[PDB]
Write an enzyme that holds these catalytic residues in place. Structure first.
Site, PDB file in Angstrom:
ATOM      1  CD  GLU A  36      -8.715  -5.720  -6.314  1.00 32.36           C
ATOM      2  OE1 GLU A  36      -9.111  -6.771  -5.764  1.00 32.36           O
ATOM      3  OE2 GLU A  36      -7.615  -5.646  -6.948  1.00 32.36           O
ATOM      4  CG  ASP A  37      -6.416  -0.323  -9.061  1.00 27.38           C
ATOM      5  OD1 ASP A  37      -6.006  -1.026  -8.109  1.00 27.38           O
ATOM      6  OD2 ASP A  37      -6.317  -0.699 -10.254  1.00 27.38           O
TER       7      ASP A  37
HETATM    8 NA    NA Z   1     -12.185   1.293  -3.428  1.00 30.37          NA
END
Ligand code: NA
Lengths: 157, 146
Positions: A36-37
Site C-alpha cells: 500500500e505505501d
Molecule cells: Na504498491
C-alpha cells in the site's frame, strides 16, 4: 507507531505470531504496508514469497482508486466473510492503528483528532468490531479480537 | 518459500525479530531494488540497517560481488554473519534435496560456499556460534566433496 517494535508491520506481525498464526499469515501482515505505501506490487510479492502469501496480502489491500468510504465498506465486508486468517490480518492491522490512537488521545480531543472526522472513523471501527466474529466458532476467535473491541469502545463511546 | 525458510532459520537460532525480518526481506529488496528510504519508512531503522549490510553492488562482476560477501562474513558482527549464512543454508538445503531427488557452475559455487564456510567463524567465541552455522558447513562438505 509505538512499542515494542516502533514499526507498524513488525507490531502487526507480533500480534499475529502471538495468536498462533502460521508463518505465511505473519508475513502477509508484515507486507501489507509495503504494498500500500511503496511501489512494490502484487506481482513482486508472488515472485519472491509465492502465491499463498500474495493471496493473503491481496485479501486486505485497498484499491486506492476508490473513495475512502468505498474502500472502508469493502474492508468491513471482507472482515465479515473472510476466513479466520483473512479476518485476523484485518483486525491485527486495526488493532495496532487504534493502539497508537489511544496513546495520542491519552495526552487531544477525539472530536478534533481524525482527519476523516469522528463520525466516519467511528462507523469504520465499529463496523470491523461488529463483523469480525461473524461465522467464527467461539473456540477459534483470537484473544487479540477482544483487545480491539475494548479499544473501539474506549475511543468511540 | 525460501524467504520464509530463512526467517525460520534465524528465529529458531534466537535472533531478534529485526534480524529475522531483514533475512526475510533480502530477496524482495534485491529483486525490486527497494531503496533504503522505502525499507526505512516501512519497516523501521533497525531493519533498514540490517538489510543494508548484505546488498551487492550490481555493477561489479559476480566474482567481485561474492568475494566482497566472503570478506563481509569474515568481519561483520554476529547478526550480519547470521544473515549471510542463513541465506546460503537455505539455498544449499534446496540443492541437496534436488541432488537426492549450479548457478554459474560447480567450481564457482564451490569456491563461494567454501569461502563463506571458512570465514563465518572468524572473530567469534565457540559458544556464540549458532548451531545452524554447523548445519551449513556440513551441507557445503556433502555437496562439494568432488
Ligand atoms: Na504498491
Amino acid at each position: 507507531t509505538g512499542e515494542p517494535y516502533f514499526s507498524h508491520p513488525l507490531n502487526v506481525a507480533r500480534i499475529l505470531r502471538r495468536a498462533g498464526f502460521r508463518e505465511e499469515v505473519v508475513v502477509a501482515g508484515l507486507l501489507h504496508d509495503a504494498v500500500e505505501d511503496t511501489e512494490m506490487t502484487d506481482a513482486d510479492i508472488r515472485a519472491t514469497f509465492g502465491d499463498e502469501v500474495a493471496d493473503l496480502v491481496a485479501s486486505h489491500t485497498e484499491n486506492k482508486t476508490l473513495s475512502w468510504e468505498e474502500r472502508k465498506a469493502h474492508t468491513i465486508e471482507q472482515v465479515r466473510t473472510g476466513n479466520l486468517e483473512e479476518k485476523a490480518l484485518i483486525v491485527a492491522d486495526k488493532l495496532d492503528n487504534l493502539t497508537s490512537v489511544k496513546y495520542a488521545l491519552s495526552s487531544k480531543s477525539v472530536w478534533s483528532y481524525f482527519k476523516r472526522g469522528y463520525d466516519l472513523q467511528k462507523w469504520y471501527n465499529q463496523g470491523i468490531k461488529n463483523n469480525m466474529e461473524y461465522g467464527l466458532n467461539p473456540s477459534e476467535i483470537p484473544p487479540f479480537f477482544d483487545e480491539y473491541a475494548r479499544l473501539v469502545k474506549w475511543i468511540f463511546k
